[PDB]
Design a protein around this nucleic acid. Sequence first.
DNA 1: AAAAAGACTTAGAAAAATTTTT
DNA 2: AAAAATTTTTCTAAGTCTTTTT
Length: 548
Amino acid sequence: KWKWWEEERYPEGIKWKFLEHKGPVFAPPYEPLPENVKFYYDGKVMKLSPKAEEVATFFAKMLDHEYTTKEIFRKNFFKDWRKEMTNEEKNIITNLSKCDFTQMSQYFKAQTEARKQMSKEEKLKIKEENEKLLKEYGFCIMDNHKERIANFKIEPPGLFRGRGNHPKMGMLKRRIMPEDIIINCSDAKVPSPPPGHKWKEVRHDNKVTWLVSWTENIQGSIKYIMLNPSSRIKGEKDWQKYETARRLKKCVDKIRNQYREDWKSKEMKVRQRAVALYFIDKLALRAGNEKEEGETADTVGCCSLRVEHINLHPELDGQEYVVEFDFLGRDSIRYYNKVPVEKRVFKNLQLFMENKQPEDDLFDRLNTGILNKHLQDLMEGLTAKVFRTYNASITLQQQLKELTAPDENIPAKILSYNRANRAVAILCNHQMMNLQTKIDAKKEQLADARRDLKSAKADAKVMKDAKTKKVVESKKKAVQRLEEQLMKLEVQATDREENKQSKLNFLDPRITVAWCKKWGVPIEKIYNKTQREKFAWAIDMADEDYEF
DNA sequence: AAAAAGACTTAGAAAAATTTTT
DNA sequence: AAAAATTTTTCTAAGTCTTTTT
């Protein structure tokens, strides 16, 4: 059981009518280091204050990671650690390199190993304590039901792990108290703050979806506590997301033949945005918001391209005209491509590239803000991200219908599905030998069992009784079980091998549901509980003849 | 119109949990 | 009977997009 797609449209603007919960689970108080776990600075044994010893542990735990080998990290870490230090220590500890965490490191490594092998009997209780935490704070009451909360556990204090070349990595993540926690609820039983505390602010805003919010010290940005992907306040928007990408599917031809004329505009921004959009569409390039310089890791999207991320080569690789992309994309993923394009864009690109130093914005007089405004102008609620959802649902849908072999069995049909998924990861780009010794092992185990039926075949030929035919048939199914078993490992092998370098985000699930249904493939084999619990609506309201 | 704050979605990377190899 | 290997779950950083306001 669960709503809700069989439900009556909540209007825009209203998120909920009733909202009540039990607040966020804070990080358990810091347990001070045991006596025989010491920290020496310069070989000199030291016992740090609890606030300083806390931070020390953070580094002690990552004393086996690449992060702690990098300057930016170590530079930011110490400075912040210096702040959590009493005048006593402050004066003494002047540099990080002189500190010795190796003992504290070994300790938590022991702790981890110790918790790796505890009495199974007790393990159940940590799964129990966990479960009770789930039962008590993991759920909430929105409107008329008990929807699950996603990240009900507050963010523990640690060391900010900046992906890529982040000038902030290593900085101290403060322990968030209730005095920082903002609460959202409706007529609801306000959750009491931990004995002796007070919330930052208890507000009732039904124009947003979050339950708890606080500002993080590292970037100031606000962190939210939201509901499970299975919830309606999330599903409603997910079902709507793909529908918007389906709305686009219609007028895509109009929009395509539209921005193709916008290349001839008597205005820069228009002539510019048209080229930008051409990329977002053709290469599933992300919008590309303007980042803070020196406050974040420097990456770029489509709008935020600089002239140094591209190069134009009239003739290259023999065709024609080529645009060489080279830049770091999202989670510092380096995007590098030479893309043969139309002449109009080539000529248009060079125009945006006269009298400018590499450090200048390629698409100036242009930003995501404008580009998206122009988008919700043509089609309702249309944005840049939508284009990727369309491009690679459509592509998946087409891939299976041309990969899936109608007459094959389940495991072989399952691989057809996975194979399509790999092909989908081509436009967006990407996201043994112990096996063969069990494959080849059972490969003979099959022929040496097909041999039983071989000799049992000659039995019935001249002994045409009946109980003999029962033995012949009992080896037939025995060979089939090995025929089955084999194909499962033969599939796994080529599958695992195929994979070298969207499933959770850009793919309309309904596409899969319709495929799974028409080819009689149980959804359990394609989706785990995480997946079908969230894709509940699509698993339900999708006939075998659904097309994007 | 423009920018900064605020809200919401995407996703990589780790941690737990599960099956499977030694 | 750990250990090694996959495959789910949790986590939270990194984007997009919207709302709010200078």
